Amino acid sequence: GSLCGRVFKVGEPTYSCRDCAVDPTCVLCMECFLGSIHRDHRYRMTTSGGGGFCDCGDTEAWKEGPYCQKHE
Ligand SMILES: [Zn+2]
Ligand SMILES: [Zn+2]
Ligand SMILES: [Zn+2]
């Protein structure tokens, strides 16, 4: 498996799963979030200030479902 790694653009929607995130900075991009188990979870969408990365593939960032359909 691989890691997404996408750099967030100013104003890009970011996705966090409150159930599976190891800490509050753990964030997924749109196309990963919708191809993962976390869409049926308690989640939150916030706008990125720019920078940071999509945490898809980072196994230590998630308690469950560290990968989406694209990256697994
Ligand atoms: Zn991503
Ligand atoms: Zn992904
Ligand atoms: Zn989740």
From Swiss-Prot:
Zn(2+) 2 binds at residues 17, 20, 38, 41. Broadly expressed, with highest levels in skeletal muscle, kidney and pancreas. Present in acinar cells of the pancreas (at protein level). Zn(2+) 3 binds at residues 32, 56, 68, 71. The RING-H2 zinc finger is an atypical RING finger with a His ligand in place of the fourth Cys of the classical motif. The UBR-type zinc finger forms a pocket that mediates recognition of type 1 N-degrons. It exhibits preference for arginine in the first position, and a lower preference for lysine and histidine. It binds N-degrons with a methylated arginine or lysine in the first position. E3 ubiquitin-protein ligase which is a component of the N-end rule pathway. Recognizes and binds to proteins bearing specific N-terminal residues (N-degrons) that are destabilizing according to the N-end rule, leading to their ubiquitination and subsequent degradation. Recognizes both type-1 and type-2 N-degrons, containing positively charged amino acids (Arg, Lys and His) and bulky and hydrophobic amino acids, respectively. Does not ubiquitinate proteins that are acetylated at the N-terminus. In contrast, it strongly binds methylated N-degrons. Zn(2+) 1 binds at residues 4, 29, 32, 54. It comes from Homo sapiens. Interacts with UBE2B; promotes the UBE2B-H2A interaction and the ubiquitination of histone H2A by UBE2B and UBR2. Interacts with RECQL4. Interacts with TEX19; does not lead to TEX19 degradation and stabilizes it. Interacts with CASP8. Interacts with ATXN3. Interacts with UBE2O. It comes from the Eukaryota. Changing residue 27 to L: 36-fold decrease in affinity for N-degron peptide RLFS. There is a cross-link at residues 63, 70 (Glycyl lysine isopeptide (Lys-Gly) (interchain with G-Cter in ubiquitin)). This is E3 ubiquitin-protein ligase UBR2. Belongs to the E3 ubiquitin-protein ligase UBR1-like family. The gene is UBR2. The chain holds residues 98 to 167 of 1755 of the full protein. A zinc finger (UBR-type) spans 3-72. A peptide binds at residues 53, 55, 58. It is found in: Nucleus; Chromosome.
